[PDB]
Amino acid sequence: LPAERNPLYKDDTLDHTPLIPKCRAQVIEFPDGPATFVRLKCTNPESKVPHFLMRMAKDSSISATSMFRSAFPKATQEEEDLEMRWIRDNLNPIEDKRVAGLWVPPADALALAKDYSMTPFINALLEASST
16 A cells, blocks of 8 residues: 555644535436535645545445545556455445445445545545535
8 A cells, every 4th residue: 555645634633624614515417316426625735636535425435446546646556456456355345336436335434544544534524414
């Protein structure tokens, strides 16, 4: 697992609460029906490259793929697949063929957030309302 992690997650001390509001809800129409997502724009303060972390409204599946691509910006395609396939072999990801990436329940998301030094951003995501 990379350790060149994004400087926005330097301090893991931060109180999660100020980040709750800048989460935004967005509905996307799928063939099986509309689905609600909660996003939180996270910006690399040095490169100023932004990324969303997203959470499905129903059952709170958080995209582990987006967490990873936000935590370690200089990651490689192989660095992704190692930590990705490590989640299939060590965590309980969901199986949703209609979305891209790997999505995990809140237990697995709060774990990876300690791995990634970004739990302040994930409780914010898990605690924001989809109205």
